[PDB]
Amino acid sequence: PHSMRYFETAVSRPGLEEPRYISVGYVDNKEFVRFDSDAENPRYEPRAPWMEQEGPEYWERETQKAKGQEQWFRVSLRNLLGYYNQSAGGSHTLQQMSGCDLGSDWRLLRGYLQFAYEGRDYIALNEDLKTWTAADMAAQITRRKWEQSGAAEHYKAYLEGECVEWLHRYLKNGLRTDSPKAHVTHHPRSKGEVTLRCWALGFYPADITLTWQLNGEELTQDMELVETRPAGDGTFQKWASVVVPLGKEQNYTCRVYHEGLPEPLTLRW
């Protein structure tokens, strides 16, 4: 029940043979370190209070690692450019999601290593941590190369050692919840139609479900709803709306499901 991920982006930029490289670390989906090559002195930086106890050796080893990753992604971008026979004056994107899950028995639960090129899946390590899945024939070049070099075994060694070790260390510090405050607003829409908007504000985590019923029956089909969005103050907002006949508003109920709620909230106009 615990996770560490690294999300990496490399962006090849027209002009200057150096592409931009960003790396973001997360523990339990909370961002805890960040590296960005666009800084004056690019270096990994703490993003969680509990990372300020590490000390300079940690930061310099990790920064050196990210400067290596910057060179690795630069070369991989050039390789891929060649595989697809693309031009060199463009901007191109390589992405990376990787890391581990730590189970209740303190063992490696699952490992992850997948890449995307231009926002599309390219190659991923399979659950067995032994084989690769390639999206197209260019990714099959890369997959032949990584089978040749035994890449999966080396990464499995990282997963079973350094990854779960540092995840455990981080967990030995870095667990909060905030129920939504919900209300229904009313908006004249068409001539004899109105919009009921069901709002959920001020909740954490961001996972939530808003539903509209007409005397118990779910209206999911003809329901408009916006992506959950950050208030910018730690909490989140969402709304779902339906269009109803003017005068019938009281036959419609909104139902809000959220972790911190002792029971799902039900609301009306």
Binding site: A66, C163, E165
Partner: peptide, 9 residues
Amino acid sequence: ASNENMETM
């Protein structure tokens, strides 16, 4: 702690 990739693509 991050991993340093080895063989390129």
